[PDB]
């Protein structure tokens, strides 16, 4: 088969600047008809892929003129000029010369915005959930940048281990931030043996960790 390689799993770009995304093939994609059968696609989160460039260097119908493609037959570059916050997503190359058709592993475009510390919020378990016998304590880290952020749970000031789970959003297409939720799960019986619940957050935008907390029963 033809192996397609994308050397960068991600590339950071400040809005307004240009970016190049590379792809390589293990065989020439040049056909004897003179065309090179290399395609570039964009895939936004939760959506189907969308074509950007066909036959290595041609802009597909309806794609902004800030996108361009070029290449040698075995090495290819997708160039995006004046990168916008909305350009976040994964860019894949694909060869359409020989069966089986094959795709590169994708390059995520990460928008480099100003560093922003998270706005932290803590939510105790609802009384509705407590009636059912379980307690979920939620810590929200909202609209921060960069992606990396650590959340530590403390119960009666004691650091927790093995009982939390985190989920992170995709980079926002307008403001270029991430949000994160951490859930600490205990039984209702164990939740009621402690008074203080806190989430401590570490992030580049904070000079020292931020803690949000509540006392059970307010």
């Amino acid at each position: 088969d033809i192996v397609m390689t994308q050397a960068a799993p991600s590339v950071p770009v400040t809005p307004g600047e240009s970016v190049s995304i590379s792809c390589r093939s293990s065989k020439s994609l040049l056909h004897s008809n003179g065309n090179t059968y290399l395609f570039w696609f964009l895939q936004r989160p939760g959506q189907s892929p969308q074509v950007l460039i066909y036959r290595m260097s041609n802009l597909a119908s309806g794609v902004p003129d800030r996108f361009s493609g070029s290449g040698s037959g075995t090495a290819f570059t997708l160039r995006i000029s004046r990168v916008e916050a909305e350009d976040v997503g994964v860019y894949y190359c694909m060869q359409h010369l020989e069966y089986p058709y094959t795709f590169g592993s994708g390059t995520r475009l990460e928008i480099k915005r100003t560093v922003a510390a998270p706005s932290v919020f803590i939510f105790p378990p609802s009384d509705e959930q407590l009636k059912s016998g379980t307690a979920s304590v939620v810590c929200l880290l909202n609209n921060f940048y960069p992606r990396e952020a650590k959340v530590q749970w403390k119960v009666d000031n004691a650091l927790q281990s093995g009982n939390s789970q985190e989920s992170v959003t995709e980079q926002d297409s307008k403001d270029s931030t991430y949000s994160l939720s951490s859930t600490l799960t205990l039984s209702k019986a164990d939740y009621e043996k402690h008074k203080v619940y806190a989430c401590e957050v570490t992030h580049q935008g904070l000079s020292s960790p931020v803690t949000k907390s509540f006392n059970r029963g307010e």
Partner: protein
């Protein structure tokens, strides 16, 4: 305007077969090829194969020759992909695309599992000049759950997080929204949760406690 409409999400048992469809409209179905693509969760694109709906001719990626069968019905402008001997490795989103990749179907999620369907419990994340509130959608199977706010009227400031798979084998997700603190006494906030696999529709009002 062209459309490739794919069949809905499928929860299917291991060892069985699943048949997904891709109905074309807005163009002459028999004049263009249909290609099939697999995307494992959080992973890249894998090409399965292609069919010419006019001739019935097919080509398969060797990796899918045993598992996949591509067919097309000219009378209903529908392309079909059947996958056999299903394993958890077949759990993925499958896309159909018109040859060349300008037009694509919306994808069909296939979950291969012997686990039972289970609807979620929805709990409020009550708000404490901006306030955050939300809903915790707990203990459901399979994916997906969708969440809207105020029947779709509230979209700004909403973040619906990816679901997490718990140790129990059940999923959970949270959806949050930030709103002006001044609105908490005058505006009703409702999270509309839909878990189509279990026919669960919950419209939970989230109030300051």
């Amino acid at each position: 305007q062209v459309q490739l409409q794919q069949s809905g999400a499928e929860l299917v048992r291991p060892g069985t077969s699943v048949k997904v469809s891709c109905k074309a409209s807005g163009y002459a179905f028999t004049n263009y090829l249909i290609e099939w693509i697999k995307q494992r969760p959080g992973q890249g694109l894998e090409w399965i194969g292609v069919i010419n709906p006019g001739s019935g001719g097919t080509n398969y990626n060797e990796k899918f020759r045993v598992k996949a069968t591509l067919t097309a019905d000219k009378s209903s402008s529908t392309a079909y992909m059947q996958l056999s001997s299903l394993t958890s490795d077949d759990s993925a989103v499958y896309f159909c695309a018109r040859g060349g990749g300008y037009y694509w179907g919306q994808g069909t999620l296939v979950t291969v599992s012997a686990a039972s369907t289970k609807g979620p419990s929805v709990f409020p994340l009550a708000p404490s000049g901006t306030a955050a509130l939300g809903c915790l959608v707990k203990d459901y199977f399979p994916e997906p759950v969708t969440v809207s706010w105020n029947s779709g009227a509230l979209t700004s400031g909403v973040h619906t997080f990816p679901a997490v798979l718990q140790s129990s084998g059940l999923y959970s997700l949270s959806s949050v929204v930030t709103v002006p603190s001044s609105s908490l006494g005058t505006q009703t906030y409702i999270c509309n949760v839909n878990h189509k696999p279990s026919n669960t529709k919950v419209d939970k009002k989230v109030e300051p406690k």
